[PDB]
Amino acid sequence: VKWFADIVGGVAAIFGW
Amino acid sequence: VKWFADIVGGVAAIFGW
Amino acid sequence: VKWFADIVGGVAAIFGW
Amino acid sequence: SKPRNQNQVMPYQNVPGWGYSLYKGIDMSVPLAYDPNNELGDLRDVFPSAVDEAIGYVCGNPAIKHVLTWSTTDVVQNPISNGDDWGGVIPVGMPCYSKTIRAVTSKTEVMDPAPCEYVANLFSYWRATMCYRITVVKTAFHTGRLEIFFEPGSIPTVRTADNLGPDQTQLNGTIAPSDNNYKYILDLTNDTEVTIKVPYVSNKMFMKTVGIYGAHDEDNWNFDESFTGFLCIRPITKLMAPDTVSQKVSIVVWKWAEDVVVVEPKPLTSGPTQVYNPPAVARDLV
Amino acid sequence: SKPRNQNQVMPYQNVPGWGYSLYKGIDMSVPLAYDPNNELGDLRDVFPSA
Amino acid sequence: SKPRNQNQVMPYQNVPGWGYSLYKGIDMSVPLAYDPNNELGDLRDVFPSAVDEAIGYVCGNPAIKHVLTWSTTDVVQNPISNGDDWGGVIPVGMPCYSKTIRAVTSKTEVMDPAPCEYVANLFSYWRATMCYRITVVKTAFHTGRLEIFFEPGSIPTVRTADNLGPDQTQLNGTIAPSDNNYKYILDLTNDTEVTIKVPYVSNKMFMKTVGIYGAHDEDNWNFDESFTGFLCIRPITKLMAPDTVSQKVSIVVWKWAEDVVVVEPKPLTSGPTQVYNPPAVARDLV
Amino acid sequence: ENTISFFDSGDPERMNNEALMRGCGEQIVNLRPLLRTFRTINDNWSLAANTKTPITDLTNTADAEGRDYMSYLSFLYRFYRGGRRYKFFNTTPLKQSQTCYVRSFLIPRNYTADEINTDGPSHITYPVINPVHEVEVPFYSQYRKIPIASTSDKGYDSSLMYYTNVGTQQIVARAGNDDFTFGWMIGTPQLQGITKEV
Amino acid sequence: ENTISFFDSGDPERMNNEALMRGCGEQIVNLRPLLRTFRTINDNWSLAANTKTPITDLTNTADAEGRDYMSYLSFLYRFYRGGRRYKFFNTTPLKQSQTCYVRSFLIPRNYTADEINTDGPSHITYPVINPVHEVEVPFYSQYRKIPIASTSDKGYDSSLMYYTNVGTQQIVARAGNDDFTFGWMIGTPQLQGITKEV
Amino acid sequence: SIIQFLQRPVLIDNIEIVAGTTADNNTALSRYVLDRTNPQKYIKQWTLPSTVLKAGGKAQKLANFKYLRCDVQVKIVLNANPFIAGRLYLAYSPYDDKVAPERRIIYTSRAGVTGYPGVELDFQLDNSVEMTIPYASFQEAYDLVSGNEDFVQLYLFTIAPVLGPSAESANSKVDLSVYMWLDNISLVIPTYRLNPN
């Protein structure tokens, strides 16, 4: 569920950081 | 904002340490 | 002041440890 | 005064990269300035965007694929071969499906993609709902009931020696009608603009993204697997318009995907990406 | 403004494997995608097993 | 009594530097004494400074650039070519703008910089407000209204084959007047000292720092980009002074920048820095 | 503006967010992270010895084929606001006793390496010890942004000035800096693929 | 003392402190940090074997050209109160089987390496394993400060006495120690640039 | 009172296009573009913002000024007869005249073109439209005394050629009208050097 925990918190990684 | 947090606190780095 | 903090506390380093 | 090291030995496998194709980690790279902390702003007034670079922003961006001319000679329940090479059918799916051949012979291939197609050529598998804007260009006089119907899976097509295209005979109002097929009967009196939203359904979870790449008579396989199905327009009625005005109208079909997702970047294209560079002269090679 | 390293020397025995026949440990391997965190589900509806 | 290591393998890319041009980090260097902790004091009584080595302390340090002699023959609204080679104009900006040629031929170039200019030759881009001290040397008799006006951007100049300089014809009271130009009309009765403060405005955020370096007939480009504009003195009135005293006075223009900032150290100079070493003999080469 | 929908499919962001844990270890939602992933452009780039060779002289026949993402995606947009990490691997037959010390510098884009004083920040790596070179050239231009590829770039940005001492063959890769994105959105180019002589 | 201002510009320390996050990853406000950044002075300095060679014999035709900052800035000032980290890289063709053990020592400035007992602190690095040498010679003089370059320095400070065992070519760099600054402020020198034979 | 003359429209060109023709006013966005000898035929490339200023007598205003930052507006008015039916697409690509052709709106497909930011336009429903082309420059602000670095090209393109009666006897023509003004205005710096053009 890890990446599915970040995609839901909209963390600053997915957007390219 | 990182370096902009140190330049405003006048930390001992910018002055050459 | 670092070494001047140890020389005043007489830490166990200066004496050879 | 000075002790030994009550530590262990730290194994080490000399490996500089340990990640050069993945998108997060300490880079072991070097910046060319004093501070490695040179990090810039959050794009205030830098350029007019909310967020541009969100696939939902590009696959939510519309782009025409092909126009279709419908004259009042084209018969009911027979698709429109006038306006393109795809007979009026449209293989639904993010990957590209159109390509022509430029010659001197050499016979290189050329495409005409949209963003929804421009991305998937960059990846391997895909999953997404599509959205097709259907706009008829006409007056308040050109009238006629137009049927748009979906058919899942492969298509009756023509496997050309170098290119690929459809088959118009297998689509008549008798062979594959639209009663036992999802349907929409658009009237043309005054309600024209449409935006069909197709979810994604198929036996296999994802789908490849070669589409028509390297497609020809023999190697049409991935194409048949890279498209859940196809829409197919077929008039219910012959275009009704007096000779006082044009006896034919035009149709435009945009394209953009919602709820999109993809899997792996290395695309299934036989070769790497070599974008077409419009040459110096029409004859000059690439 | 910039100090030296008041650290020690870290021994190192170049040994890539240090475990290739055992069943737990940091693998030092590489995944071929962006995120090494590609971890899948707990096998719900994947196939009929307890 | 003795366990194994339940650890992992620690990757390692043998790279000694990983930072030798940046200004903070564990140096991996070695000090030549017992303790690496040899750190000195905070400069109490070591030498008379508050803080010397603060660009605002050096760019806040004034330095003459050139003196201009104004005789009572020089006509109204025509700049002063007497006292320098820059016609009385002064390209505003931190980078340097003056250079002559020393010969045996060889024809090396030589400069005459100030701190405000001595720094920017050490970097690439710049952004700063400037401050020009204008001091007239005269009695209480030498009187005349003197106009100082700013003009943004490039200049009507003369692109010499080896050096660069201004053009005096394009500055008459008709061609580029000072009504639609920021202005200051200094009187010379008793109020003489002035200190103009020019903020920084330009279409581009920063500006290069080559100025006149490697500048000549052809390669004047960076010069036109390395100066937001220029000030230009032009008398409103012919110097009013009786023959009882000098029929000419002198003007001095200092220079120092406030609110300064710079970007990258590698300067845009064609070659590296080779400071002029006054040679053994006037003819001896460098 | 009638817009209809077929198949009465359940929440699409219920199947995919489920149908990646079955099929895809990674769950991609942005697109910018591609520019943080190095995938190669060249595979030989046979270089020359003791000749500081800029990189623009290479990456001009690089943003014309899309062999990477930092180019394929360029067309979609027009601007950029970040630095381009350039990683350089070696493949040269260095079975010899010489000491390779491939060296990198900083040069403004579209400068030809002859009108430059080659000082300032740098880097030196040895392929005999470390067959990589992983600089992170930042964005030291003076403008909010930059057109992707125009002809007016007489110093509006920074570049590399890759230096070497030997005749070498290199592998290359380039993604972008942690603050490297693109500007506006525009349409799409035309693509060519496989060709069949005859 | 009338001093006026143009352009009614907003807070300058509102645009720049903003207009570095758009243009400059780094936000420089001091100047001393330059002396913590190693940028090179020489690029060959071909040395000789088994001849302990001091460094002053090199860094005398180094503080006369400004090819670095520790010299270019010297002129601005007159004094200094810190140590000069000297980093030495190798480029010698050591394709051989010999063992290079380049060794460094400590010598008072302006001593000629012949009137010395070469003992005390030292360092030894092997280029075949580590083509660097990164000593941090501290400030062991006996005076508050020191003129930048005079002729009366018969032991008023410490230096290197770089030793080697082979005929070598080295790259060099020097910035300064964590407590290396300058003294008074003074004016500026004259600069020469490009020359055009004819 | 100081700028609003800028924020006051101006007519650029009054255009007409007739049925049956086969010229630059037709050939709507060739599906493919193989050669630069047969690119997509446009209608009227406007190299904004210049063409705006040099008209509407606004230049006389911009005189004695140097720098500018302005997002331009547009208003297309269209008046054709119900017996006509067609569709066009307006689009703007910055620096399209200062960039390699492989990326230009020209030498590019119909799909990509219509993917460029802009808007469609019908002759019956969207009789009149507008648009806001923002400050597309990449520098502090646009210069005026130079007037050479026009940072945009406003490309007009068609989708479906004009369509009318079978007889198409000279009455199956349409007519256009373009208006332009500027918003988000900023006049900053004076000078005496004036763009004579």
TrEMBL record, chains A, B, C:
<protein>
    <submittedName>
        <fullName>Structural polyprotein</fullName>
    </submittedName>
</protein>
Automatic annotation (TrEMBL), chains G, H:
<protein>
    <submittedName>
        <fullName>Structural polyprotein</fullName>
    </submittedName>
</protein>
<feature type="domain" description="Dicistrovirus capsid-polyprotein C-terminal">
    <location>
        <begin position="17"/>
        <end position="195"/>
    </location>
</feature>
